[PDB]
Design a protein around this ligand. Structure first.
Ligand SMILES: Cc1ccc(C(=O)Nc2ccccc2C(=O)O)cc1S(=O)(=O)Nc1ccc(Br)cc1
Length: 123
């Protein structure tokens, strides 16, 4: 209940970005979800996530998880546990975190607000 930022894995974004730790199962809040421009291929969704301290904009949902967005269980403000993810590095050096398995712990409606005051992580 109280101490809302205590619901999130503070420091997980830095851990993912700095250490490349993939064994952790961090709890993050969805701040925003947006489709990416795609061709005739399945839609892809990019997420702005928060660990309470930082936000990071380079999350992508694995296509297998698209139903979570399209049926609305995964939406802005919800709190999720990431059970499996990988990091991929693009030609230009940018890294993207692909969310492969995730659990919605609290619905957007049950949370209702951005938790804490996270600031953008500097990639
Ligand atoms: C469009 C697209 C889709 C997918 C991947 C990707 O890296 N996929 C994977 C890579 C490795 C393993 C698994 C996967 C997986 O998707 O399951 C990259 C791109 S992109 O670079 O051309 N544009 C883009 C990148 C990031 C963000 Br935020 C927004 C747009």
């Amino acid at each position: 209940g109280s101490h809302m930022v205590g619901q999130l894995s503070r420091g997980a974004i830095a851990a993912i970005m700095q250490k490349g730790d993939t064994n952790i199962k961090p709890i993050l809040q969805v701040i925003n979800i947006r489709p990416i421009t795609t061709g005739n291929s399945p839609p892809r969704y990019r997420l702005l996530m928060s660990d309470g301290l930082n936000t990071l904009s380079s999350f992508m949902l694995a296509t297998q998880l698209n139903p979570l967005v399209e049926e609305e269980q995964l939406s802005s403000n919800c709190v999720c546990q990431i059970h499996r993810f990988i990091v991929n590095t693009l030609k230009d050096g940018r890294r993207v975190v692909i969310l492969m398995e995730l659990e919605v712990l609290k619905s957007a409606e049950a949370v209702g607000v951005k938790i804490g005051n996270p600031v953008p992580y500097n990639e």
